Amino acid sequence: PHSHPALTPEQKKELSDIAHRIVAPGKGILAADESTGSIAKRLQSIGTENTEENRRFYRQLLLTADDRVNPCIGGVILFHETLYQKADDGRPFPQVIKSKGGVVGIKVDKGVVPLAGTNGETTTQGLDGLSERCAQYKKDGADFAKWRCVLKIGEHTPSALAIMENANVLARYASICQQNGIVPIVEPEILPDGDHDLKRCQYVTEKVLAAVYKALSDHHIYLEGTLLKPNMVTPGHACTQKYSHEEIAMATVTALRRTVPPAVTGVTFLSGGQSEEEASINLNAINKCPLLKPWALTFSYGRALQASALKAWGGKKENLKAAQEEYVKRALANSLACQGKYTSSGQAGAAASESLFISNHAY
Amino acid sequence: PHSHPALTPEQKKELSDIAHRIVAPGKGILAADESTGSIAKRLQSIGTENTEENRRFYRQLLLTADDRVNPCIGGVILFHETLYQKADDGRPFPQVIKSKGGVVGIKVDKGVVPLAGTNGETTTQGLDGLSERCAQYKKDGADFAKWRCVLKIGEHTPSALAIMENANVLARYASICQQNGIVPIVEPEILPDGDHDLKRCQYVTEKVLAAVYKALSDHHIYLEGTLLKPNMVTPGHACTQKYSHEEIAMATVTALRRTVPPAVTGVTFLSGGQSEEEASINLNAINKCPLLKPWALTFSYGRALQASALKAWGGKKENLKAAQEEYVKRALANSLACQGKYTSSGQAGAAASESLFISNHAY
Amino acid sequence: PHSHPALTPEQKKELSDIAHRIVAPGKGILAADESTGSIAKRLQSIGTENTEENRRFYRQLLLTADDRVNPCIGGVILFHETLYQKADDGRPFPQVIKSKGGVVGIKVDKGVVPLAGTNGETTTQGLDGLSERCAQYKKDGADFAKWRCVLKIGEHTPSALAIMENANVLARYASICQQNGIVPIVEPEILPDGDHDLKRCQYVTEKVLAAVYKALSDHHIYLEGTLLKPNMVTPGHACTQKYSHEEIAMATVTALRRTVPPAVTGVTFLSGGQSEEEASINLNAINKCPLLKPWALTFSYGRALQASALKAWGGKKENLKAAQEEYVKRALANSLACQGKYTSSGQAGAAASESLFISNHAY
Amino acid sequence: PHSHPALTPEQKKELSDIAHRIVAPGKGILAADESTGSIAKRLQSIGTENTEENRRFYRQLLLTADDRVNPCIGGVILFHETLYQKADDGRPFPQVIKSKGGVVGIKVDKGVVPLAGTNGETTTQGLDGLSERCAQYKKDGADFAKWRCVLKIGEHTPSALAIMENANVLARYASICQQNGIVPIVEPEILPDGDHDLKRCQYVTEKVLAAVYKALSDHHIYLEGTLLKPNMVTPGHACTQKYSHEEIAMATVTALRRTVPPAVTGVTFLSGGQSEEEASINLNAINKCPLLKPWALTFSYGRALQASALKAWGGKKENLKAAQEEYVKRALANSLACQGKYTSSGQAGAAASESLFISNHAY
Known part of the structure; x- marks a missing residue:
């Protein structure tokens, strides 16, 4: 060639x-x-209305947390709206982020669309005019981007078409980003839905990632200038089998070692439905896994960093500091976790997560 | 599977x-x-300012040509603007076309964009929100669409990436159209630029079409509900070798027979810079080729059907009927040609009006 | 390219x-x-010993049948051993076939081997030294060859790997044959084993054939110098739903129309365990199918042409004529069938079949 | 899946x-x-006749070197003949090797064969009956195998077909080896022939390796149970631009980091015509490269470990010790080199002797 x-x-x-x-x-x-629309559901659970003000305020609560989170947050992924909003101190959010030492990121995909001839499978759109958007975003303070592809594990999925199509569209997106000086976060998310065990997810993850990297190569992507945002390898939500976090860590790292070239700068795990503590514990075990891990294994969490912050807030401006505190704590916990130094005894014995799918009722 | x-x-x-x-x-x-942008270049050549009224008038001149064209025009591909314009008599353009027995088509791609890491190669965008657009266009009178991919022959082109990427995007577009009751015209245009010979073009055309059909299969496309709009197989514009119309015909039909499944309903050739007469003569020869041709071999001409009309018109509202006559004459010629019945007085095809690249000056 | x-x-x-x-x-x-190994079981069913002489004789029985079979047989595929055997008159079998107007073919594959990591799928071996073998076979009177790949329909089969690997091996084989002036018959047989229905078989056939042709294009195969030997599209042997021959013909022709380019010279169907009468009737229906078929649709039958001859033979030299007649009749019937001129004779009582398991214990 | x-x-x-x-x-x-045929060449260059006894003697010479080589040689790849030969003391070579702590390997490919339609490109044969051969070899003392694919850099090479085909055959071979308890060394050698520069070699190496690993994934290969044997990234033999060992090291390690997953146990470089000293220095520089290398970077040298031993021997049994000493010296030098602990004297040393040519004489 x-x-x-x-x-x-x-x-x-x-x-x-x-x-x-x-x-x-x-x-x-x-x-x-x-x-x-997504943040609307979140605000509703705390009895708050979906107005641009509440959205700006909520984002402000996280973005203006004290400098203790500074060394913990390397980057913040923002939605289009938030990129053009300002904090009460008069500074545009992207400036607040940079002043705190973080890099500003922007979600550039336009959602998933169904693939005809498949069993409810999808691909993701957003390539049209992406070049010009990236140019504007770069000018406006953004240095990295995010694009999310969704894949599901079932009797006939992911199909070969779904794997090839999503891998190809991720590569197109990545290519356009690099031309505009923007680092693309490649997110091939495999949903944890179903009753499949840990091994099936590991198998599917390995096949999906191999396709992703062949596509990136085909499209001449500069790997050192990218980050991978995958799901951790876990059993399906309805799986009746019990696993320790060391098993999840082992399966996750093994899958990554078999597919992700060491040139990839880092892997930022999505917590996909995991609780805050569970997500920290899993990331910690992943970093404690005795296998050679040539890339940074860190976090790119949404709910796992915000759950207790949103709860503590509850629309009441009064609870500002206390709500921020919750966030600062999860940030600190995960900072330790991505270094393999988060303390806990691989906890899962009493602190609950609905193991109803493991109890006698799941029979 | x-x-x-x-x-x-x-x-x-x-x-x-x-x-x-x-x-x-x-x-x-x-x-x-x-x-x-394109129509501008056309209007400028004849000294007519690019105005909505002049574009609407010009399109009217073509669409309202007399019934003699009715037996010749099966479909008309329109640009978005034209689909919503009306004739002087108040009738929307789509209705005029349909009353004359034609099917209305709409261009749905959003132009070519560069592929990084290639020698000036492109892919085509326009997939974002295509489903909703097709649903609207359908309601508004359109039954078929056109999407154009462009590839070029050169030292390192077309590359494996450009072939795969263009074939894949063409399949995605086709899939979305079929979900909305719209017949997609698959257009993988290989440019005639360069000094490559007939055989070079034949070879690249065969490789390209093979990729296109494999992609359509992968994306579950219904072939019987599609049309192919390829380039005829011709030598590059700067080739120094002289060829007969029978040679281009043999090469074109051979290339298609080796790659296009019989299920494909029809092949509507693009003129690609050929003069009006040349396009008719070549299409006629293609239809008179002894080889078995399992699909209709017809035309999908732009300039090859408008050159004389536009010139004859000259922007002068007084030249309307004369300009329309030129158009009617080209439509009739190609109608006969797509049936292999176009034998100009003397039973022969015209020769090259210049062909400087075959003279001593090309040495 | x-x-x-x-x-x-x-x-x-x-x-x-x-x-x-x-x-x-x-x-x-x-x-x-x-x-x-294969003919041993044929001889055993008729209580005859599997010796070289018995194999030579049985082969001679078929090859020397009267002149009526001359116009019905365009070619005969032989096993290595038979190519070097001679008829009682001291004439090499290849000579006998040629004198009767037939072309001599040789099976060149070395059987199926398992594909690790699949659910009992296979690929086919025989490429090593194939070029030398082909050059020798051509010298010895062989003009075409046969290579059989086998695919299975099941819940997870055929897998993407099996499809890709078998298509690629067929393409390697075809390439080597053509380099040695030998016409390769490409045989991607989809076994009729299972309880799947007609739609299922059609879907799978369309997918495999599309991969087969993409592979042949990638390997630069000259399609006009090849023949395709596929399974007809039928329900699985264990399928309970009874389909009409018209349905089978429609499914078969439609699948071929969507995948086999017009340049392929002919399609020589395998009977795949169909009775002699059934194979002729389906072949006729396929040829009567109202859809356009740009390639010859004929037969390449093994047992569907020999069942009665073998039976009527029984092992006795005296039955020579009886057996030959049965073969001649079947050849004639299929000669008419491949032209859509076969008048299905129906059935009453019995004619011929294979095996013994649940019948006449004490005779 | x-x-x-x-x-x-x-x-x-x-x-x-x-x-x-x-x-x-x-x-x-x-x-x-x-x-x-290959060994015959080396014998001739030192005035020795190609005989089984001389071949056995030469191999014995290398295999019976003193105990200092034991910690240096982890494995020895033998040709079929040698695996069944015995040393002067009656012990079969495999036994001699294991006694000194080494693992026994066996070359299992059957050479390269041309791919029709390419610019002199090849693929490799040897798959037929490979499983049975592996079963025999395993039983006879071999624990790993080697299969060589050859790719060439030029204007239109390596082509898409060559890359896909060679990568697919390596995968097939690797699969069969693993089913028989044999570790396969995947050797995709990109020839140093040509005048192309360092960047071109790096570009090609990256594309080839990506294809190799995608094929290995497609065929369900257990990467931890494999070794990769590639060429170092260097300019073509006919390139006139001078490069430093640091540039070679950086290019090589950079290409591997972008394509070879961490799970791969090790990379054993082939010398590719480099002089003994050159091969040691480059290997050392590679291990000195500051970039993170998650796999063992060592040698699998043919000529680079035998050049001096061969000439010192000169076909005279008397020169046995002198010859064995030269070998131990190169083996020790490379043991240090694969640990980044090797140092040079300043110039060429006892390694350069043969040098590059261009149609000097065919021998």
Whole structure:
């Protein structure tokens, strides 16, 4: 094949530097890129209405937390709206983030659309005019982007089409981002839905990631200038089998070692429905896994970092500091976890998570 | 593998009926889908300012040509603007076309975008929200669509990436159209630029079409409900070798016979820079080729059907009937040509009006 | 891509001439390439010992049948051993076939081998030294070859791996044959085993054939110099739903129309365990199918042409004529069937069949 | 997709264990697997006749070197003949090797064969009856195998077909080896022939390796139970631009980091015509490269470990010790090199002797 450099040494350096800053030791990502409809559900659970003000305020609560979170947060993924909002101190959010030492990120996908001829499978849209959008976003303070593809495990899924199509669209997105000096976070999310065991998820994860990396190569993607945002390898939500977090860690790291080239700067795990403590515990075990891990294994959590913060807030401006405190604590917990130094005894024995699917009722 | 029907027998029948109606014996397509930017270049050549009124007038001149064209035009591809315009008599353009027995088509792609890491190669965008657009267009009178991918022959082109990427995007587009009752015209245009010979073009065309059909299969496309719009197989514009129309015909038909499944309802050739007469002569020869041709071989001409009309018009409202006459004459010529009955007085085809690249000056 | 002509005009010509001769109007193929292990069971069912002489004699019985079979047989596929055996008159079997107007073919594969990590799927071996073998076989009177790949329909089969691997091995084989002036019959047999229905078989057939042709294109195969030997589209042997022959014909023709390019010279169907009468009736229905078929649709039957001859033979030399007649009759019937001229004779009582398990214990 | 375990936990355990033994710290592989035709060349260059006794003597010379080589040689790749030969003391070579702590390997490919339609490109044969051969070899003392695929850099090479085909055949071979308890060394050698530069070689190496790992994933290969044997990234033999060992090291490690998953147990570089000293220095520089390398980076040298031993021997049994000493010297130098602990004297040394040519004389 013939080389026609997509990027110059200068462009490669910029991308790599950005990617490394985000995942520097002890740092992770705060995923606060929920679209208006998504954040609406969250605000409703706390009896708060979905207005631009409450959204701006809620985002402000997280973004303006004290400097204790500074060394914990390498980057923050924002939704379009929030990128153009300002804090009470008059500063645009992207500036608040940068002043605190974090990198600003932007969600660029436009949602999933169904693939005809499949069993409820999807692909993701958002490529049209992405180049110009990325140029504007870069100018407006964003240095990294996020694009999410969804895949489901079932009797006939993921199908070969779904795997090929999602891997290809992720590569297109990644290519466009790098041309505009933006680091793309590749997110091939495999849903935990179903009653499949740990091994089936590991198998599917390995097949999906292999396809993802072949596509990135085909599209001439600069790996050092990217981050991978995968699901941890866990059993299905309805699985009746019990697993320790060391098993989840082992399966997760094993899957990654078999598919992710060491040039990839970092892997930022999505917690996908896991509770705050469970997500920290799992990330900690992953970093404690005795296998050689050549990339940073950190977090890119949404709910796992916000659950207790949103709860404590509950629309009441009064509870501002206490709500921020909850967030600061999860940030600190996960900072320790991505370094393999979060203390707990691999806890799962009494602190509950609905193990109804393991009890006698699941029979 | 496992089937999850993309289309019901009812949806299939409709798509099939539409495709067959467009390429019925003696019928072809008028491609009047130029966008503002392209139409500008056309109007400028004749000294007519690019105004909505002049674009609407010009399209009216073509669409309201007398019934003699009716037996010749199976379909008309329109640009978005034109689909919502009306004729002087108040009738919406789509209705005018339909009253004359034609099927209305709409251009749905959003142009080509560069593929990084290639030698100036592109892919085409337009997938975002395509489903909703197709649903609207359908309600508004359109039954078929056009999407154009462009590839070029050169030292390192087309590359494996460009071939795969364009074939895949074409399949995605086709899939979305079929879900909305719209027949997709698959257009993988290989540019005639360069000094490559006939055989070079034949080779690349065969490789390209093979990729296109494999992609359509992977995406579960209903072939009977599609039309192919390829480039005829010709030598590059700067080739120094002289060829006869019988040679281009043999090469074109051979390339298609080796790649296009018989289920494909029809092949509507693009003129690709050929003069009006040349396009008719080549299409005629293609239809008189001894080889078995299991699909209708017709036209989907833009300039090849408008060159004389536009010139004759000259923006002068007084030249209307004369300009329309030129158009009617080209439509009649191609109608005969798509049936292999176009034998100009003297039973022969015209020769090259210049062909400087075959003279001593090309040495 | 870039061309480096795999074949010269003269080589293509030769392959094209051979392919056309085999499938000329009213002609089909006698598949008599049973290996030592396969024919042993045939001889055992008729209480005859499996010796070289018995194999030579049985083969001679078929090859020397009266002149009426001449116009019905375009080719005969032989097993290695038979190619070097002689008729009682001291004439090599290849000579006897040629004197009767037939083309000599040789089975070149070395059987199926398991594909690890699959649910009992296989690929086919035989590529090693195939080029040398082919050059020798051509020298010895063989003009075409046969290679059989086997695919199975089940819940998880055929898998993407099986489809890809078998298509690629068929393409490697076809390439080597053509380089040695041997026309390759591509045989991607989808076994009829299972309880799947017609739609299921059609779906799978369309998917495998599309992969087969993409593979042949990638490997630069000259399609005009090849023949396709597929299974007809039928329900699984264990399927309870009874389908009409019209349905089977429609499903088979539709599948081929959507995947087999017009350049393929002919399709020589395998009977796949169908009774002699059934195989002829289905072949006739396929040829009467109202859809356009741009390729010859004929037979390449093994047991569907021999069941009665073998039975009527029984092992006794005296039965020579009896057996030959049964074969001649079947050849004639299929010669008519491949032209849509077969008048289904129906049935009453019995004719011939295979095996013994639940009948006449004490005779 | 769905899993159907190719291997059991126990089988995986054995494969992983063997792979790790071969590439243990400070250890490399002696590639003494030259066929009769290749070894004949080396013998001729030193005035010795190609005979079984002389071949046995030469191999014995290398295999019976003093105990200092024991910690240096993790494995020895033998040609079929040698595996069944015995040393002067009656012990079969496999026994001699195991007694000194090494693992016994066997070359299992049957050479390269041309791919029709390419610019002199090849694929490799040897799959027929490979499982049975592996079963025999395992039983006879071999624990790993080697299969060589050859790719070439040029204007249109390596082509898409060559890359896909060679990667697919390596995967098939690797699968069969693992089913028989044999660790396969995957050798996708990109020839140093040509005038292309360093960047071109790196570009090609990255594309080839990505294809290789995608194929290995598709065929369900257990990566932990494999070794990769690639070429170092260097300029073509005919390139006139001078490069430093640091540039070679950076290019090589960078290419591997972008394509070779961490799970791969080790990378055993082939020397590719490099002089003994050159091969040691480059290997050392590679291990000195500051970039993170999650796999063992060692040697699998043929000519680079035998050049001096061969000439010092000169066909005279008397020169046995002198010859063995030269070998031990190169083996010790590379043991240090694969640990980044090697140092040079400043210039060429006893390694350069043969040098590059261009049609000087065919011999």
